Design an enzyme around this catalytic site. Structure first.
Site, short mmCIF file in Angstrom:
data_model
loop_
_atom_site.label_atom_id
_atom_site.label_comp_id
_atom_site.label_asym_id
_atom_site.label_seq_id
_atom_site.Cartn_x
_atom_site.Cartn_y
_atom_site.Cartn_z
N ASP C 89 0.82 -1.22 0.00
CA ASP C 89 0.00 0.00 0.00
C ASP C 89 0.86 1.27 0.00
O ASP C 89 1.99 1.23 0.45
CB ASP C 89 -0.98 0.06 1.19
CG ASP C 89 -2.15 -0.93 1.08
OD1 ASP C 89 -2.51 -1.33 -0.04
OD2 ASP C 89 -2.71 -1.30 2.14
N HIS C 167 3.30 -5.37 15.11
CA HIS C 167 3.20 -4.22 14.23
C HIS C 167 2.66 -2.96 14.94
O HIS C 167 3.25 -1.89 14.87
CB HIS C 167 2.34 -4.54 13.02
CG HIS C 167 2.20 -3.37 12.11
ND1 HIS C 167 3.27 -2.88 11.39
CD2 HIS C 167 1.17 -2.54 11.88
CE1 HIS C 167 2.87 -1.82 10.71
NE2 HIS C 167 1.61 -1.59 11.00
MN LIG Z 1 2.04 1.66 7.99
MN LIG Z 2 0.39 -0.01 10.14
#
Ligand SMILES: [Mn+2]
Ligand SMILES: [Mn+2]
Ligand SMILES: [Mn+2]
Ligand SMILES: [Mn+2]
Lengths: 160, 5, 294, 66, 294, 5
Positions: C89, C167
């Protein structure tokens, strides 16, 4: 004639930190921090003007409905009369406008190629034609794809 | 655009 | 599978003007997705890793920045790597980025590791550029193959029983590591709960305990939530990514949490550095910075 | 404290219709349609699970005897 | 009967969390029913109306959607209104809905008009929610008072001799508007016949002529019925309600018939918008949509 | 429930 170039510069390191616990196993270097060089913005354009989350989300809402439908391949011979279907775009929800539509069969012309074949009915969804997706398209783009078809035309159709 | 741009 | 050939072609652009594509064949990319998925499933969802290791944050399809990160950090297998997610992305070269990383995972499965980011999720990467890139360069069926792959990524790692990596961050629901270990794959990311929070949550210096997150999903957590977690699990540090930080790294709660972000000048709209954290055998932690030239 | 949010988005309007009767006095606008925003389902649960037509009919049947 | 005070109390919730009740007194509501009955009986059963006018479909007790419709369309007497029936049942706030509509009828009797829907009938609203609401919040005698009032509602309107409006639709027995004008009030809605049809029938694309109606009452009618009817009475359009339609409005028989429906996300079971049709002095018709925020 | 729900 592009010549890439690499380099390292040291900067002041992590400040010393007094009174950390003696039970703490990890520690932090006080050594200079290496700053390595990557491409300038002039060398490497990191921008991407093609991301459009509003358009994508509108397509996605439509896509979500389609894959509840059972999909099946249809192949029609395109004769002189054409395909023998008319189409209507419908949005994924109430009053969506014109941009991201599902393309449904509105009309199946009597005697026409779609009718003589039997597998396509009013309210069928045209998912793919000539290998081109018609999910979340404009009705004019759909019309263009259909008029440009020739000979034996390959469909993916949705219903239910 | 917050999902993060 | 053709793996070394694939790697060779992906690395072939190292001396080129950035932006130049590597167009592997569809069958090639399918093979990487299918092989790496088997590997991810055969390894634990909560990875247990040992130093030395280099840890990188978000890449977001900035292929040429990833190449620099390997150039300076050492190409696998010179260094062991853990990436914390967000490979795709925003950038224009998500495909190159994820293919090179999958290739290295396949070639060096015990020395190269990849966690799942919030963008390794169909409902997010549909929207923020990856689907568009797959549709443009390949076909949407290939995007579905990547989804099947991303659904098998592990979720978190513990480095030498002392550094907890994921994350996003912590979850109000996380009380035992077994809660992570019992998560079955393939799985999608839900819009709420443990898995969501691990991929979505953020530290906030202005909150005490747990707060609402500006993103519209998950939570923010304060410095005492961090201290408590570490003390409870006999851990020293939380290492996470997910937020652009100006220097590439940024500490929180004294030095009990670090944020790593590895995409410099992120999507051409920030002027940040990227950084990686190295952990050596004695558990000394250090920072290497990738800064765009002026 | 709840604060209502009001807005209006315009969308393409009614297409021009092909060959209308000249004898027709009313006409339809081709101007953009206003789409005004009402409450989301989160803000306004429009469900009513209290409605039970079968039980109601039963009591009604009895009432009509009474 | 303090009209302004009653209207004031009904509108007070305009800034509130939807769902909040307005509890008027039993005498206030009885005064609304009695005063509005005198007005309905003093005006014809077939209304002869002139543009400008905003026409609205079913509301079904969705009180807070009715307030938004007025906020965007203009509160009386800023705009003139014709509602096509079905004010009560299904919704949790049938009482506030009908009360506000009767208050406006009494306050602006030449600028505000209410037709009878199939739910303004004791044998229907006994079972679909309205009796229950009256019984819970007031007493069952109040419900009989509403019945007296509803039994006096007009059943059709013609706008500028060109738009025929009714709740349901056409009737195979309707040959002359005199058949509507001679109907005596108060009246119940019968199981069959002209008055039933006007409140219950539906248009159907698949029928040639008159067909059986899946509702177990009245009929369906095809597009040729609509054409014949319109040509015969020198009318341009039929405006009706009675069926949920996705966009809030929906044309039939080309644009010779329009269905209007003004309860968005109808009783939380559909994701439809509501709509109203505006008719200006030049007989230009347009649509305003009420769509639930995401 | 068809009476229309
Ligand atoms: Mn990111
Ligand atoms: Mn992220
Ligand atoms: Mn109704
Ligand atoms: Mn009705």
């Amino acid at each position: 004639p592009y010549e890439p170039e690499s380099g390292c510069v040291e900067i002041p390191g992590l400040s010393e930190e007094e009174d950390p616990a003696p039970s703490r196993k990890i520690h932090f270097s006080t050594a200079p921090i290496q700053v390595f060089s990557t491409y300038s913005n002039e060398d490497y354009d990191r921008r991407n003007e093609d991301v459009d989350p509003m358009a994508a989300s509108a397509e996605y809402e439509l896509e979500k409905r389609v894959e509840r439908l059972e999909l099946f391949p249809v192949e029609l011979e395109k004769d002189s009369e054409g395909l023998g279907i008319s189409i209507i775009g419908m949005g994924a929800g109430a009053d969506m406008g014109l941009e991201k539509l599902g393309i449904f069969v509105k009309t199946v012309t009597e005697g026409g190629a779609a009718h003589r074949d039997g597998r396509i009915q009013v309210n069928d969804l045209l998912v793919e034609v000539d290998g081109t997706s018609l999910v979340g398209v404009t009705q004019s783009f759909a019309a263009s794809v259909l008029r440009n078809t020739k000979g034996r035309v390959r469909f993916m159709i949705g219903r239910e | 655009x917050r999902x993060x741009x | 599978l053709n793996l070394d050939s694939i790697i060779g072609r992906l690395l072939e652009v190292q001396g080129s003007r950035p932006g130049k594509n590597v167009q592997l064949t569809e069958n090639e990319i399918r093979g990487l997705c299918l092989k790496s998925r088997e590997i991810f499933l055969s390894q634990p969802i909560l990875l247990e890793l040992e130093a030395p290791l280099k840890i990188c944050g978000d890449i977001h399809g900035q292929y040429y920045d990833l190449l620099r990160l390997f150039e300076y950090g050492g190409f696998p297998p010179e260094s062991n790597y853990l990436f914390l997610g967000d490979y795709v992305d925003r950038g224009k070269q998500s495909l190159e980025t994820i293919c090179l990383l999958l290739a290295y995972k396949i070639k060096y499965p015990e020395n190269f590791f990849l966690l799942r980011g919030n963008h390794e999720c169909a409902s997010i990467n549909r929207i923020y550029g990856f689907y568009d890139e797959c549709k443009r360069r390949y076909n949407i069926k290939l995007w579905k193959t990547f989804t099947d792959c991303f659904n098998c990524l592990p979720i978190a790692a513990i480095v030498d029983e002392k550094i907890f990596c994921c994350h996003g961050g912590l979850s109000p629901d996380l009380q035992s590591m077994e809660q992570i270990r019992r998560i079955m794959r393939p799985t999608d990311v839900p819009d709420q709960g443990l898995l969501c929070d691990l991929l979505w949550s953020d530290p906030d210096k202005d909150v005490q305990g747990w707060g609402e997150n500006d993103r519209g999903v998950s939570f923010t957590f304060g410095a005492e939530v961090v201290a408590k977690f570490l003390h409870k699990h006999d851990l020293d540090l939380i290492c996470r990514a997910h937020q652009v930080v100006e220097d590439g790294y940024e500490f929180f709660a004294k030095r009990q949490l670090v944020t790593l972000f590895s995409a410099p000048n992120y999507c051409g709209e920030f002027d940040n550095a990227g950084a990686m954290m190295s952990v050596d055998e004695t558990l000394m932690c250090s920072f290497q910075i990738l800064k765009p030239a002026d």
